A = this chain, B = another copy of it.
Amino acid sequence: MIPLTPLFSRYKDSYLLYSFRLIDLLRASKSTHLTKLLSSQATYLYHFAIQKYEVQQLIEWAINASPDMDLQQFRIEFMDKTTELNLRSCQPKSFTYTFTTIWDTMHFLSLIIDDMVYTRDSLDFVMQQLKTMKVLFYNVFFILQCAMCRDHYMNVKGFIIYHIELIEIALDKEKYGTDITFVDSYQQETAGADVSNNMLMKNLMAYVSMTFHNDINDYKWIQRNKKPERMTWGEYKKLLNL
């Protein structure tokens, strides 16, 4: 499926760390609503990482874990519990949690979307996975503390979700007889809509999340009142072997 590269290996570990830090919040949840949101998100996260059954036991354990433990103690009991559930594949290699962990996670999910679409057949299955992807991007938690970031993301996250919906639309047209034409550039996709073609950019969500990532970093100069090395699509594809 997705090319194995150094950068993808980091994405994968960051993804697991993100998921670990999410289930640690369950014991602390101050509402039923938050508990249901976290539980579903973490279940979805491991889904994209028998396995469904073991994950359910892991999440249920996380739900009942003592609220009076610290993170470091939760981490100990989590490494034991994942080992006992034969879920060693859920254990992160590193636990240093930063903005990069969150970015890696979003870029990881984007790669998963692109891969599911490229290797589809079952279009109902992929259309259901996409809806789950929309829920995941809608409900990204920062876990770390940055209110400004949370405010900014809640304003512009629809940019990513919108593009997931474009893929749904493409798959719907394919179900009804117009196959997907994969194109090399975003410009072919956006221009093609301005008219019975069904053109979709290859690696669309890699590009979408890369451009979104650049925009966030450009905007923070406005946020700090300061004068401004941005990632290019050419070098991003190279780093990930796309």
Q: A190-B190, A193-B211, A195-B230 are in contact. Are A165 and B169 (CB under 8 A)?
A: no
Determine the chain B residues whose CB is within 8 A of the CB of A97 once the complex forms. none
B-binding residues in A (CB < 8 A): 127, 134, 138, 155-162, 165-166, 168-169, 172, 176, 185-187, 190-191, 193-195, 211-212, 214-215, 218-219, 221-222, 227-228, 230, 232-234
> What is the predominant secondary structure among interface residues of chain A facing chain B?
helix
Copies of this chain, how many? 2
Determine whether the beta carbon of B169 is less than 8 Å from that of A155.
Answer: no
CB A47 to nearest CB in B, in angstroms, measures 20
A190 to B191, CA, bound (A): 11
- Which residue of chain B is the closest to A210 with respect to CB atoms? B194
A92 to B139, CA, bound (A): 39
A195 to B215, CA, bound (A): 12
The answer, among B161, B166, B194, B218, for a CB contact under 8 Å with A232, is: B194
Determine whether the beta carbon of B195 is less than 8 Å from that of A186.
Answer: no
Determine whether the beta carbon of A134 is less than 8 Å from that of B155.
Answer: yes
Q: Beyond the given A165-B219, A194-B234, please list 10 additional residue pairs across the A-B interface where CB-CB is below 8 A.
A: A138-B155, A155-B158, A156-B165, A158-B161, A158-B162, A159-B161, A168-B222, A169-B222, A186-B190, A195-B232
A212 to B214, CA, bound (A): 22
CB A167 to nearest CB in B, in angstroms, measures 11
A194 to B211, CA, bound (A): 8
Determine the chain B residues whose CB is within 8 A of the CB of A214 once the complex forms. 193
Determine whether the beta carbon of A215 is less than 8 Å from that of B168.
Answer: no
- Which residue of chain B is the closest to A155 with respect to CB atoms? B161
5 A-B pairs (CB sep. < 8 Å): A155-B161, A156-B161, A158-B160, A159-B162, A187-B190
A191 to B201, CA, bound (A): 14
Determine the chain B residues whose CB is within 8 A of the CB of A138 once the complex forms. 155
Determine whether the beta carbon of A169 is less than 8 Å from that of B227.
Answer: no
The answer, among B127, B157, B194, for a CB contact under 8 Å with A158, is: B157
CB A117 to nearest CB in B, in angstroms, measures 16
